[PDB]
């Protein structure tokens, strides 16, 4: 639940100033419709 930082920031370097689904897996999947 806790998250460590992406990287350890440091004095020298610190400066302060994706895929959709296939088609394979889209007719083989159950897409619930709203009502709207």
């Amino acid at each position: 639940a806790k998250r460590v930082a992406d990287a350890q920031i440091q004095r020298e370097t610190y400066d302060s100033n994706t895929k959709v689904a296939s088609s394979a897996v889209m007719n083989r999947r159950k897409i619930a419709m709203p009502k709207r």
Binding site: A1, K2, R3, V4, A5, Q8, I9, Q10, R11, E12, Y14, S16, N17, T18, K19, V20, A21, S22, V25, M26, R29, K30, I31, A32, M33, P34, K35
Partner: protein
């Protein structure tokens, strides 16, 4: 004039050995394009290393060490030459013996050496440098404490791998005092060293807590200089990756109001770190989520979720979503989030291109829906009020589109949301 100097340095006469070492040190000090390469390639480093031994004048030891230090404070490869000449143990043993001018040179040298990589850092420690270095923080000479602190922090720096904890942790007592210094540079570097030490396992965090550091760090979050804020904020944030008890010490020290201040820093990255830090407190127990709310942190967090830079928004979304966890056992929390207008920004974030965050965002929206549903079932209404807020903010459409996301878990939670609350 140089092949000559190489020979004047090799003379067995002590009088000329000095004169030469002094000329080397001087050219090595030119501000513009120091001749570190040329002096190294004339072969004279191992000769200068000899001039730093116990069996040598106080004035010659100084000049050889100052010349070498100018070398060791150049490029990674010019530092390497000095290390390969076995200069470190004699730098270290000069911290005991030498006068104060000398101590300041060697400590700087060892700082530059320790800062080159995690290898050279470990190596300085293996040579038992920690012990003498701590011995310097008696000196009451501002510039030497300043330098010793700079070096000390470089001995603590680096996570992969960590330095040897049983050695660097002996510096906590000294640092704990140093974060009370009135010298800005000292204070800054002491804070860095703490940020590194606190970045680690629960044993390390507890060490930091047991010397009483966290009270002072919290005080330093409101320092005028962002140079102090940044590493201080970081140390505090690392402490709160710890357990509920550890987190509670920082809250008890007054961190939530300091965090308020930082959520309006002019620097974007201070705001990002403050969001992160708060998010690990809303990740904590139910009292601590309420403390966050009572410190009026939600409203700026929400405002950052709508308008901040992307990296900052993600951190704010974590802070807000983690807080909705505790809505299943305290529904006032969810009600207040909703009422502070967090639905439209959470919705609008679903189209960010980060599957980590989309997931968190949908968990926040599900928790809002779950409490909006148990609100209408508990008092016999025919509408989920939150479901309609999400709908009117174009978030149903956005959640719907998440079924077309490659990650199965995203599709699955999204599918579940449209069925359960939009059927």
């Amino acid at each position: 004039e140089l092949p000559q100097m190489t020979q004047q340095l090799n003379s067995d006469d002590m009088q000329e050995q000095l004169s030469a070492t002094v000329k080397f040190r001087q050219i090595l000090s030119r501000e513009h394009r120091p001749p570190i390469d040329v002096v190294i390639q004339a072969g004279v480093v191992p000769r200068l290393v000899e001039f730093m031994r116990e069996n040598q004048p106080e004035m010659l030891q100084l000049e050889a060490a100052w010349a070498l230090t100018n070398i060791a404070s150049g490029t990674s490869a010019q530092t390497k030459v000095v290390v390969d000449a076995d200069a470190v143990p004699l730098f270290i043993q000069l911290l005991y013996t030498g006068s104060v001018e000398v101590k300041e040179q060697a400590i700087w040298a060892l700082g530059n050496v320790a800062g080159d990589s995690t290898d050279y850092r470990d190596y300085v420690l293996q040579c038992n440098a920690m012990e003498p270095i701590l011995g310097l923080f008696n000196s009451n000479k501002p510039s030497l404490i300043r330098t010793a602190t700079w070096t000390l922090s470089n001995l603590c720096r680096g996570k992969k791998p960590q330095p040897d904890w049983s050695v660097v942790s002996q510096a906590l007592p000294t640092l704990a005092k140093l974060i009370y210094s009135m010298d800005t540079e000292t204070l800054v570097d002491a804070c860095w060293a703490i940020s590194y030490l606190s970045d680690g396992p629960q044993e390390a965090i507890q060490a930091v807590i047991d010397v009483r550091i966290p009270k002072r760090l919290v005080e330093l979050l409101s320092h005028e200089s962002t140079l102090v804020q940044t590493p201080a904020l970081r140390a505090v944030g690392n402490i709160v990756t710890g357990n509920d008890l550890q987190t509670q010490v920082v809250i008890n020290a007054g961190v939530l109001p300091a965090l308020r201040l930082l959520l309006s820093s002019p620097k974007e990255n201070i705001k990002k770190e403050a969001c992160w830090t708060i998010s690990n407190i809303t990740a904590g127990n139910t009292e601590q989520i309420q403390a966050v709310i009572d410190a009026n942190l939600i409203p700026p967090l929400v405002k950052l979720l709508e308008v901040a830079e992307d990296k900052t928004k993600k951190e704010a979304c974590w802070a807000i979503s983690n807080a909705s966890s505790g809505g299943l056992q305290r529904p006032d929390i969810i009600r207040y989030l909703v009422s502070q207008g967090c639905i439209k920004p959470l919705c609008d974030l679903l189209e960010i291109a980060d599957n980590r965050i989309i997931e968190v965002t949908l968990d926040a929206l599900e928790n809002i829906l779950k409490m909006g549903e148990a609100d209408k079932e508990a008092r016999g209404l025919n509408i989920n009020e939150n479901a309609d807020f999400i709908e009117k903010a174009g978030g149903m459409e956005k959640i719907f589109n998440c079924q077309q996301n490659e990650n199965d878990k995203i599709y699955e939670k999204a599918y579940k949301i449209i069925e359960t609350y939009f059927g």
